[PDB]
Amino acid sequence: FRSCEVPTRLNSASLKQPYITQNYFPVGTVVEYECRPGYRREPSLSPKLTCLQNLKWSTAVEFCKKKSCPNPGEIRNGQIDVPGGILFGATISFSCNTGYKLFGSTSSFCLISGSSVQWSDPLPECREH
């Protein structure tokens, strides 16, 4: 007649495990949480969304935070340009020092929606010609 509905929703958290089925949960289910790309949980504790008593799933705090891109690092013989922030979905432009020609790329992308905070194309080259 009732059963547990669309489970609890946290600031960036969403169920990881095929615990769910997410159809009709009978009251009494401990489920586990997954943070979205570019998020970190709280200090990583009891990740327990129980279907409690009153189809009112149990505790729900803030099991996420955020993981933004941690700087594309530094290129070489030259330097790397950050227009004021390297968050998720960002990017840079490579600029070599004097006398050199960029032989690798003139940009690279911050993407998190694949393998967590990571960048596409690391060190190009700066080849003096």
PDB file of C-alpha atoms in Angstrom:
ATOM      1  CA  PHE A   1       0.000   0.000   0.000  1.00  0.00           C
ATOM      2  CA  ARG A   2       2.938   2.295   0.753  1.00  0.00           C
ATOM      3  CA  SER A   3       6.483   0.947   0.474  1.00  0.00           C
ATOM      4  CA  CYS A   4       9.596   3.100   0.265  1.00  0.00           C
ATOM      5  CA  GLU A   5       9.646   5.611  -2.579  1.00  0.00           C
ATOM      6  CA  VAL A   6      12.375   7.336  -4.599  1.00  0.00           C
ATOM      7  CA  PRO A   7      15.210   7.033  -2.029  1.00  0.00           C
ATOM      8  CA  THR A   8      16.782   9.939  -0.181  1.00  0.00           C
ATOM      9  CA  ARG A   9      18.740  12.594  -2.072  1.00  0.00           C
ATOM     10  CA  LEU A  10      21.886  14.277  -0.752  1.00  0.00           C
ATOM     11  CA  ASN A  11      23.713  17.394  -1.857  1.00  0.00           C
ATOM     12  CA  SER A  12      25.529  15.439  -4.555  1.00  0.00           C
ATOM     13  CA  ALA A  13      24.958  11.847  -3.509  1.00  0.00           C
ATOM     14  CA  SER A  14      23.211   9.077  -5.432  1.00  0.00           C
ATOM     15  CA  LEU A  15      22.957   5.344  -4.840  1.00  0.00           C
ATOM     16  CA  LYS A  16      25.922   3.279  -6.017  1.00  0.00           C
ATOM     17  CA  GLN A  17      25.056  -0.351  -5.485  1.00  0.00           C
ATOM     18  CA  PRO A  18      22.363  -2.481  -7.189  1.00  0.00           C
ATOM     19  CA  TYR A  19      20.910  -2.681  -3.716  1.00  0.00           C
ATOM     20  CA  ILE A  20      18.157  -0.547  -5.136  1.00  0.00           C
ATOM     21  CA  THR A  21      15.917  -1.916  -7.853  1.00  0.00           C
ATOM     22  CA  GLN A  22      14.145   1.334  -6.906  1.00  0.00           C
ATOM     23  CA  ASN A  23      10.655  -0.063  -7.486  1.00  0.00           C
ATOM     24  CA  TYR A  24       9.044  -0.917  -4.164  1.00  0.00           C
ATOM     25  CA  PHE A  25      11.387  -1.187  -1.189  1.00  0.00           C
ATOM     26  CA  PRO A  26       9.694  -2.787   1.854  1.00  0.00           C
ATOM     27  CA  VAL A  27      10.606  -0.860   5.004  1.00  0.00           C
ATOM     28  CA  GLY A  28      13.925  -2.257   6.197  1.00  0.00           C
ATOM     29  CA  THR A  29      16.747  -1.780   3.693  1.00  0.00           C
ATOM     30  CA  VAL A  30      20.265  -0.466   4.220  1.00  0.00           C
ATOM     31  CA  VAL A  31      21.605   0.997   1.007  1.00  0.00           C
ATOM     32  CA  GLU A  32      24.902   2.585  -0.002  1.00  0.00           C
ATOM     33  CA  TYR A  33      25.674   5.949  -1.581  1.00  0.00           C
ATOM     34  CA  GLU A  34      27.787   7.128  -4.510  1.00  0.00           C
ATOM     35  CA  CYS A  35      28.961  10.715  -4.973  1.00  0.00           C
ATOM     36  CA  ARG A  36      28.795  12.146  -8.480  1.00  0.00           C
ATOM     37  CA  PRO A  37      31.882  12.837 -10.658  1.00  0.00           C
ATOM     38  CA  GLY A  38      33.918  15.520  -8.966  1.00  0.00           C
ATOM     39  CA  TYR A  39      32.588  15.039  -5.455  1.00  0.00           C
ATOM     40  CA  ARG A  40      34.038  13.659  -2.225  1.00  0.00           C
ATOM     41  CA  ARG A  41      31.982  12.271   0.654  1.00  0.00           C
ATOM     42  CA  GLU A  42      32.151  13.449   4.228  1.00  0.00           C
ATOM     43  CA  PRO A  43      35.144  11.915   6.155  1.00  0.00           C
ATOM     44  CA  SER A  44      33.813   8.639   4.753  1.00  0.00           C
ATOM     45  CA  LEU A  45      31.522   7.095   7.358  1.00  0.00           C
ATOM     46  CA  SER A  46      28.344   5.051   7.826  1.00  0.00           C
ATOM     47  CA  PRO A  47      26.874   5.387   4.311  1.00  0.00           C
ATOM     48  CA  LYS A  48      23.570   3.890   5.341  1.00  0.00           C
ATOM     49  CA  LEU A  49      20.291   5.009   3.773  1.00  0.00           C
ATOM     50  CA  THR A  50      17.926   2.644   5.515  1.00  0.00           C
ATOM     51  CA  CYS A  51      14.309   2.309   4.537  1.00  0.00           C
ATOM     52  CA  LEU A  52      13.223   2.884   8.066  1.00  0.00           C
ATOM     53  CA  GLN A  53       9.728   2.561   9.434  1.00  0.00           C
ATOM     54  CA  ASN A  54       7.504   5.141   7.867  1.00  0.00           C
ATOM     55  CA  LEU A  55       8.697   4.850   4.331  1.00  0.00           C
ATOM     56  CA  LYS A  56      10.868   7.598   5.730  1.00  0.00           C
ATOM     57  CA  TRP A  57      14.384   6.511   4.803  1.00  0.00           C
ATOM     58  CA  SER A  58      16.796   6.832   7.662  1.00  0.00           C
ATOM     59  CA  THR A  59      19.620   9.314   8.279  1.00  0.00           C
ATOM     60  CA  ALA A  60      20.737  11.630   5.489  1.00  0.00           C
ATOM     61  CA  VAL A  61      23.492  14.115   6.214  1.00  0.00           C
ATOM     62  CA  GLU A  62      25.867  15.224   3.451  1.00  0.00           C
ATOM     63  CA  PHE A  63      27.882  12.312   2.135  1.00  0.00           C
ATOM     64  CA  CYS A  64      29.330  14.459  -0.654  1.00  0.00           C
ATOM     65  CA  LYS A  65      31.386  17.629  -1.070  1.00  0.00           C
ATOM     66  CA  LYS A  66      33.239  18.209  -4.326  1.00  0.00           C
ATOM     67  CA  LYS A  67      36.354  17.173  -6.231  1.00  0.00           C
ATOM     68  CA  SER A  68      37.363  19.935  -8.663  1.00  0.00           C
ATOM     69  CA  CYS A  69      40.244  19.662 -11.130  1.00  0.00           C
ATOM     70  CA  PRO A  70      43.493  20.043  -9.173  1.00  0.00           C
ATOM     71  CA  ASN A  71      45.465  22.189 -11.620  1.00  0.00           C
ATOM     72  CA  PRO A  72      46.528  20.756 -15.026  1.00  0.00           C
ATOM     73  CA  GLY A  73      50.039  20.969 -13.667  1.00  0.00           C
ATOM     74  CA  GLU A  74      52.855  22.708 -15.508  1.00  0.00           C
ATOM     75  CA  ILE A  75      53.968  22.365 -19.121  1.00  0.00           C
ATOM     76  CA  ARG A  76      57.579  22.914 -20.141  1.00  0.00           C
ATOM     77  CA  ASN A  77      59.907  25.530 -21.630  1.00  0.00           C
ATOM     78  CA  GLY A  78      57.085  27.941 -21.506  1.00  0.00           C
ATOM     79  CA  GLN A  79      54.115  27.706 -19.153  1.00  0.00           C
ATOM     80  CA  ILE A  80      50.414  27.066 -18.783  1.00  0.00           C
ATOM     81  CA  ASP A  81      47.555  29.537 -18.731  1.00  0.00           C
ATOM     82  CA  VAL A  82      44.706  29.415 -16.241  1.00  0.00           C
ATOM     83  CA  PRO A  83      42.053  32.107 -16.950  1.00  0.00           C
ATOM     84  CA  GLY A  84      41.218  32.175 -13.250  1.00  0.00           C
ATOM     85  CA  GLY A  85      40.245  28.738 -12.014  1.00  0.00           C
ATOM     86  CA  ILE A  86      40.592  25.054 -12.774  1.00  0.00           C
ATOM     87  CA  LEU A  87      37.289  23.492 -11.786  1.00  0.00           C
ATOM     88  CA  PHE A  88      35.506  20.580 -13.447  1.00  0.00           C
ATOM     89  CA  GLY A  89      34.863  21.178 -17.139  1.00  0.00           C
ATOM     90  CA  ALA A  90      37.746  23.629 -17.487  1.00  0.00           C
ATOM     91  CA  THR A  91      40.759  23.986 -19.768  1.00  0.00           C
ATOM     92  CA  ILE A  92      44.021  25.826 -20.413  1.00  0.00           C
ATOM     93  CA  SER A  93      46.200  27.212 -23.186  1.00  0.00           C
ATOM     94  CA  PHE A  94      49.857  26.249 -23.498  1.00  0.00           C
ATOM     95  CA  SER A  95      52.406  28.984 -24.179  1.00  0.00           C
ATOM     96  CA  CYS A  96      56.073  28.169 -24.720  1.00  0.00           C
ATOM     97  CA  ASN A  97      59.064  30.336 -23.894  1.00  0.00           C
ATOM     98  CA  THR A  98      60.961  32.359 -26.507  1.00  0.00           C
ATOM     99  CA  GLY A  99      62.307  30.603 -29.576  1.00  0.00           C
ATOM    100  CA  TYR A 100      60.143  27.518 -29.225  1.00  0.00           C
ATOM    101  CA  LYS A 101      57.243  26.130 -31.243  1.00  0.00           C
ATOM    102  CA  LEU A 102      54.334  24.229 -29.720  1.00  0.00           C
ATOM    103  CA  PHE A 103      54.423  20.687 -30.942  1.00  0.00           C
ATOM    104  CA  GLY A 104      51.770  18.913 -28.908  1.00  0.00           C
ATOM    105  CA  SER A 105      48.691  21.052 -28.365  1.00  0.00           C
ATOM    106  CA  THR A 106      47.511  24.599 -27.694  1.00  0.00           C
ATOM    107  CA  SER A 107      44.954  23.584 -25.057  1.00  0.00           C
ATOM    108  CA  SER A 108      43.697  20.781 -22.813  1.00  0.00           C
ATOM    109  CA  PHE A 109      40.456  19.967 -21.041  1.00  0.00           C
ATOM    110  CA  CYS A 110      39.438  19.271 -17.478  1.00  0.00           C
ATOM    111  CA  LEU A 111      36.922  16.430 -17.564  1.00  0.00           C
ATOM    112  CA  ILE A 112      35.589  14.610 -14.517  1.00  0.00           C
ATOM    113  CA  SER A 113      32.692  12.790 -16.118  1.00  0.00           C
ATOM    114  CA  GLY A 114      34.779   9.779 -17.109  1.00  0.00           C
ATOM    115  CA  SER A 115      37.569   8.709 -14.773  1.00  0.00           C
ATOM    116  CA  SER A 116      37.258  11.291 -11.982  1.00  0.00           C
ATOM    117  CA  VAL A 117      39.279  14.500 -11.787  1.00  0.00           C
ATOM    118  CA  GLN A 118      41.637  14.094 -14.724  1.00  0.00           C
ATOM    119  CA  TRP A 119      42.890  15.996 -17.766  1.00  0.00           C
ATOM    120  CA  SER A 120      42.992  14.985 -21.422  1.00  0.00           C
ATOM    121  CA  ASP A 121      46.355  16.020 -22.820  1.00  0.00           C
ATOM    122  CA  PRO A 122      49.313  16.509 -20.420  1.00  0.00           C
ATOM    123  CA  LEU A 123      52.697  17.875 -21.430  1.00  0.00           C
ATOM    124  CA  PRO A 124      52.847  18.914 -25.082  1.00  0.00           C
ATOM    125  CA  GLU A 125      56.275  19.852 -26.290  1.00  0.00           C
ATOM    126  CA  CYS A 126      58.026  23.118 -26.931  1.00  0.00           C
ATOM    127  CA  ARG A 127      60.374  22.442 -29.830  1.00  0.00           C
ATOM    128  CA  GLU A 128      62.759  25.168 -30.939  1.00  0.00           C
ATOM    129  CA  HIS A 129      62.780  25.381 -34.739  1.00  0.00           C
TER     130      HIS A 129
END
